[PDB]
Design a protein around this ligand. Structure first.
Ligand code: UDP
Ligand code: CL
Length: 458
């Protein structure tokens, strides 16, 4: 009998991608039926394409469950990021999850961290076990879990403390103040209110899945499994299930024509647009590096809005001058496919977590260029694990300062010129493939989670 697992993602590819890979892992790999309760329409078109493809490729085990949004008035959070606004619109629709869950006869609910504080109560009154899929690193899970106690300890009669400094996560390490997600400095920020509420409820859920592997983050994973992080001393089981594997266009025809390990692939993720002054230094750094490069560019946060002319954003001269030696697009690329290709030798990445798991699975060295949110925490893991290297001094969003074309070009040449870089990254690939293979720590963790789902048949 196939356990029924209901999966409840939030908005953006960073939250949807790992849910689509989990669904396939649970269905093909462990004999589960999976219902993915996703909101329609999606903020980005890339989410729509991924959902459409998921429900074909992984049918009949994986199925769509329609989840309608109550109307939400965005006037409440003026100037908020569109994905954060969809996070909140979806959180206030959690009512509707109750009926859906009764109808699905779920063995278990797996909810996005983003939605955990509102999904867990609904699961409890419908009698369904409720697990959280944390979508970023174990280091960031350890931050999310400790941040409420941090804020509490720094609360002093006569106020609720504003700002964040160095965060000494028990039994893990120190997050320097400058690596704290920018939004967390404001306890009233839309993201922060969600992040704090979701961290508070984590002690009271049935377990937490993380798309990482023990050898990648041994200290963070060891602290989460002992419960160091909560001082109360009680934490749910943590299942390390990653790096989860993925489920011919002009850029691929180009790429296959290039020599092995020759191409610098460049992308800052699905929801970041680099300001133009920094964009020009990156263009000229790539040019000056002398390396072949494949560069994905965004002018807006949401792909649907992106109308800018590539020529108009970078330079019509630049584009003609790098013809042939390089490939530059403002459209979507199937990055999972690029990162498996033998012709890629370097990934300049914003250190979004799903991007890092992809470079980890395939052993691709990472030039870390974090921009916001969790990305400086994740960049320190890049450096720490030997997946790549990270110049801590490069500025990120909200800081003044510009990484120059010389800095880019020199760091690109060093990464590809120093063989230890490719070798360290390949050792991460080796450990990642082992983790998800039969005898690996991630395969076993996933087997244990599926066993829990089997024991919940009603
Ligand atoms: O042009 C693009 C940009 C992104 N991605 C994928 O989108 C996800 C981005 O998620 P991540 O957590 O790295 O960052 P976010 O976009 O949430 O900042 C990853 O699976 C990438 O492989 C892609 O396939 N093509
Ligand atoms: Cl660690």
């Amino acid at each position: 009998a196939r356990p029924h697992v209901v999966l409840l993602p939030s908005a953006g590819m960073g939250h949807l991608v790992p849910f689509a890979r989990l669904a396939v892992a649970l269905s093909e790999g462990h004999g589960c039926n999976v219902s993915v309760a996703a909101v329609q329409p999606t903020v980005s078109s890339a989410e729509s394409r991924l959902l459409d493809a998921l429900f074909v490729a992984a049918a009949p085990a994986v199925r769509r469950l329609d989840f309608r949004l109550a109307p939400f008035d965005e006037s409440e959070f003026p100037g908020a990021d569109p994905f954060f606004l969809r996070f909140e619109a979806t959180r206030r629709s959690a009512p509707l999850l109750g009926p859906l869950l009764d109808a699905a006869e779920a063995s278990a609910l797996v909810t996005d961290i983003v939605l955990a504080s509102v999904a867990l109560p609904v699961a409890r009154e419908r009698g369904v076990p409720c697990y959280v899929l944390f979508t970023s690193s174990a280091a960031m899970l350890s931050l999310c879990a400790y941040f409420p106690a941090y804020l509490d300890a720094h609360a002093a009669a006569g106020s609720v403390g504003v700002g964040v400094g160095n965060v000494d996560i028990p039994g893990v390490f120190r997050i320097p103040k400058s690596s704290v997600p920018q939004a967390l400095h404001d306890p009233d920020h839309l993201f922060t209110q969600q992040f704090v509420a979701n961290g508070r409820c984590l002690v009271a859920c049935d377990g937490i899945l993380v798309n990482t592997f023990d050898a990648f983050e041994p200290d963070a994973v060891t602290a989460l499994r002992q419960g160091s992080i909560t001082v109360s001393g009680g934490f749910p089981p943590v299942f390390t299930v990653g790096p989860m594997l993925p489920v011919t266009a002009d850029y691929m025809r180009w790429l296959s024509a290039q020599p092995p390990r020759s191409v610098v692939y460049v992308s800052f993720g699905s929801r970041k647009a680099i300001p133009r002054d920094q964009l020009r230094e990156l263009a000229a750094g790539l040019e000056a590096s002398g390396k072949r490069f494949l560069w994905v560019v965004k002018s807006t946060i949401v792909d649907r809005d992106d109308t800018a002319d590539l020529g108009g954003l970078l330079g019509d001269g630049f584009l003609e001058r790098v013809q042939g030696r390089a490939f530059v697009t403002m459209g979507w690329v199937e990055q999972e496919e690029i990162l498996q290709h033998g012709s890629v030798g370097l990934f300049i990445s914003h250190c979004g977590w799903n991007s890092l798991t992809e470079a980890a699975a395939f052993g691709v060295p990472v030039l870390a260029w974090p921009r916001f949110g969790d990305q400086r925490v994740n960049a320190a893991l890049v450096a720490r694990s030997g997946l790549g290297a990270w110049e801590e001094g490069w500025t990120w969003d909200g800081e003044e300062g510009l990484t120059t074309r010389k800095e880019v070009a020199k760091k690109i040449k060093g990464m590809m010129g120093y063989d230890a870089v490719a070798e360290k990254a390949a050792k991460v690939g080796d450990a990642a493939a082992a983790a998800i293979a039969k005898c690996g720590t991630s395969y076993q963790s996933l087997e244990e989670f599926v066993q829990r789902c089997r024991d919940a048949e009603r």
